[PDB]
Design an enzyme around this catalytic site. Structure first.
Site, PDB file in Angstrom:
ATOM      1  N   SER A  88     -47.131  37.546 -23.403  1.00 37.66           N
ATOM      2  CA  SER A  88     -47.449  36.396 -22.531  1.00 37.66           C
ATOM      3  C   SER A  88     -46.792  36.593 -21.225  1.00 37.66           C
ATOM      4  O   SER A  88     -47.624  35.970 -20.219  1.00 37.66           O
ATOM      5  CB  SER A  88     -46.849  35.008 -23.091  1.00 37.66           C
ATOM      6  OG  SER A  88     -47.494  34.540 -24.240  1.00 37.66           O
TER       7      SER A  88
ATOM      8  N   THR B  80     -43.692  54.035  -8.594  1.00 36.70           N
ATOM      9  CA  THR B  80     -43.808  55.249  -9.523  1.00 36.70           C
ATOM     10  C   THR B  80     -42.424  55.590 -10.490  1.00 36.70           C
ATOM     11  O   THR B  80     -42.376  56.447 -11.488  1.00 36.70           O
ATOM     12  CB  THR B  80     -43.989  56.700  -8.860  1.00 36.70           C
ATOM     13  OG1 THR B  80     -42.895  56.909  -7.790  1.00 36.70           O
ATOM     14  CG2 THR B  80     -45.446  56.463  -8.259  1.00 36.70           C
TER      15      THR B  80
ATOM     16  N   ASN C 246     -47.158  39.300 -30.044  1.00 37.55           N
ATOM     17  CA  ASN C 246     -45.714  39.685 -30.342  1.00 37.55           C
ATOM     18  C   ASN C 246     -45.292  40.051 -31.889  1.00 37.55           C
ATOM     19  O   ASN C 246     -44.342  39.742 -32.215  1.00 37.55           O
ATOM     20  CB  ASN C 246     -44.842  38.590 -29.692  1.00 37.55           C
ATOM     21  CG  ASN C 246     -45.307  38.125 -28.263  1.00 37.55           C
ATOM     22  OD1 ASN C 246     -45.626  39.105 -27.689  1.00 37.55           O
ATOM     23  ND2 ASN C 246     -44.995  36.726 -27.925  1.00 37.55           N
TER      24      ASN C 246
ATOM     25  N   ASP D 280     -53.279  27.868 -20.656  1.00 35.32           N
ATOM     26  CA  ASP D 280     -51.998  27.628 -21.316  1.00 35.32           C
ATOM     27  C   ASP D 280     -51.792  26.365 -21.353  1.00 35.32           C
ATOM     28  O   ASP D 280     -52.353  25.302 -21.926  1.00 35.32           O
ATOM     29  CB  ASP D 280     -51.194  28.457 -20.492  1.00 35.32           C
ATOM     30  CG  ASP D 280     -49.979  29.140 -21.209  1.00 35.32           C
ATOM     31  OD1 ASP D 280     -50.082  30.297 -21.375  1.00 35.32           O
ATOM     32  OD2 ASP D 280     -49.022  28.288 -21.540  1.00 35.32           O
TER      33      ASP D 280
ATOM     34  N   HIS E 275     -44.105  27.007 -20.878  1.00 37.87           N
ATOM     35  CA  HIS E 275     -44.752  28.408 -20.785  1.00 37.87           C
ATOM     36  C   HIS E 275     -45.881  28.643 -19.807  1.00 37.87           C
ATOM     37  O   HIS E 275     -45.963  29.713 -19.133  1.00 37.87           O
ATOM     38  CB  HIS E 275     -45.314  28.520 -21.924  1.00 37.87           C
ATOM     39  CG  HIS E 275     -46.006  29.761 -22.668  1.00 37.87           C
ATOM     40  ND1 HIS E 275     -47.339  30.077 -22.553  1.00 37.87           N
ATOM     41  CD2 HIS E 275     -45.386  30.927 -23.176  1.00 37.87           C
ATOM     42  CE1 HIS E 275     -47.550  31.261 -23.119  1.00 37.87           C
ATOM     43  NE2 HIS E 275     -46.402  31.799 -23.344  1.00 37.87           N
TER      44      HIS E 275
ATOM     45  N   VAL F   9     -62.462  42.583 -23.126  1.00 38.89           N
ATOM     46  CA  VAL F   9     -61.345  42.149 -22.153  1.00 38.89           C
ATOM     47  C   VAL F   9     -60.260  42.859 -22.033  1.00 38.89           C
ATOM     48  O   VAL F   9     -60.472  44.083 -22.667  1.00 38.89           O
ATOM     49  CB  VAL F   9     -61.082  40.566 -22.830  1.00 38.89           C
ATOM     50  CG1 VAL F   9     -62.055  39.595 -22.645  1.00 38.89           C
ATOM     51  CG2 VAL F   9     -60.350  40.716 -24.156  1.00 38.89           C
TER      52      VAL F   9
ATOM     53  N   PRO G  81     -63.023  43.695 -27.656  1.00 36.19           N
ATOM     54  CA  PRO G  81     -62.987  45.131 -26.773  1.00 36.19           C
ATOM     55  C   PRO G  81     -63.224  44.864 -25.460  1.00 36.19           C
ATOM     56  O   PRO G  81     -62.703  45.703 -24.613  1.00 36.19           O
ATOM     57  CB  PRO G  81     -63.974  46.004 -27.415  1.00 36.19           C
ATOM     58  CG  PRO G  81     -64.268  45.398 -28.893  1.00 36.19           C
ATOM     59  CD  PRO G  81     -63.885  43.931 -29.102  1.00 36.19           C
TER      60      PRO G  81
END
Length: 279
Positions: free
Chosen positions: A224, A16, A161, A39, A69, A177, A175
């Site tokens: 990512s 929290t 990014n 990826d 990556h 996903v 929308p």
């Protein structure tokens, strides 16, 4: 369970408050779930994956991750030290070349591959797909992500990014996903994170330590990196029986830490992924 001296992002998703370093989670740990990492590939031999990672598909001359990556993202999903869901099964789909680039037609084929391939895998607790990739708006790319979600896979995608509205990027702008923005260890919106009404959730994305190729580790930043936190969280919550692939994005938003991030533009959700685990 408690993992001491955990990466800040893992500690953040079970807290929290910012500024702690222990990750707390139910020991079920995503056992019985599966996460596809779509990826550059996954270095499945990395000791951090403990035999739970495998390449299932490539569109290039090798299924190896020659970039890093995809291995980093997979590590945030499910590696023993760097992962959210430490007992999930990881499946690599190499749609990006070793320079990190890929044609939309290949990416679409990879999404439709996962929608079918899950029927060849044992995932009794459910299936997630993590998509730390994107480019400019494409209705065909968005539709592929929508199909994958419709097929019964929890789809988590990077917002991008560009420090811009994610409405102009795909699959971020689809929308149906789960579109994931990035935050830092001080609960600030990451400097590069896209924003906008299409975002569903934020996850840790600045200075994220995870696995890398050559059996190594490193810290990198991006939406990512935030995306696999959410994908791993979904797998973990599905194993617990708290939600399903169709409802997990909404459940994560329902149960998120609310109103704690700074520099969130008016009209973008102020929601930070949180496992609500009570040790």
């Amino acid at each position: 369970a408690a993992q001491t001296n955990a990466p800040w992002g893992l500690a953040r998703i079970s807290s929290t408050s910012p500024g702690t370093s222990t990750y707390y989670y139910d020991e079920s740990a995503g056992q019985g779930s599966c996460v596809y990492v779509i990826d550059t590939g996954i270095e499945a031999s990395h000791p951090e994956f403990e035999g739970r990672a495998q390449m299932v598909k490539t569109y290039y001359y090798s299924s190896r991750d020659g970039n890093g990556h995809g291995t980093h993202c997979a590590g945030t999903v499910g590696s023993r030290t760097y992962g959210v869901a430490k007992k999930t099964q990881l499946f690599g789909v190499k749609v990006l070349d070793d320079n990190g680039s890929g044609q939309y037609s290949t990416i679409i084929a990879g999404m439709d591959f996962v929608a079918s391939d899950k029927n060849n895998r044992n995932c009794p607790k459910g299936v997630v797909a993590s998509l730390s990739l994107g480019g400019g708006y494409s209705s065909s790319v968005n539709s592929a992500a929508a199909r994958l979600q419709s097929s019964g896979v929890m789809v988590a995608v990077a917002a991008g990014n560009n420090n811009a509205d994610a409405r102009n990027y795909s699959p971020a702008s689809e929308p149906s996903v789960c579109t994931v923005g990035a935050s830092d260890r001080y609960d600030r919106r990451s400097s590069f994170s896209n924003y906008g009404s299409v975002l569903d959730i934020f996850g840790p994305g600045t200075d994220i330590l995870s696995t890398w190729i050559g059996g190594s580790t490193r810290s990198i930043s991006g939406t990512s990196m935030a995306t696999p936190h959410v994908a791993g969280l979904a797998a973990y919550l599905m194993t617990l029986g708290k939600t399903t692939a169709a409802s997990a994005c909404r459940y994560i938003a329902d149960t998120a830490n609310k109103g704690d991030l700074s520099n969130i533009p008016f009209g973008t959700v102020n929601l930070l992924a949180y496992n609500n685990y009570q040790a």
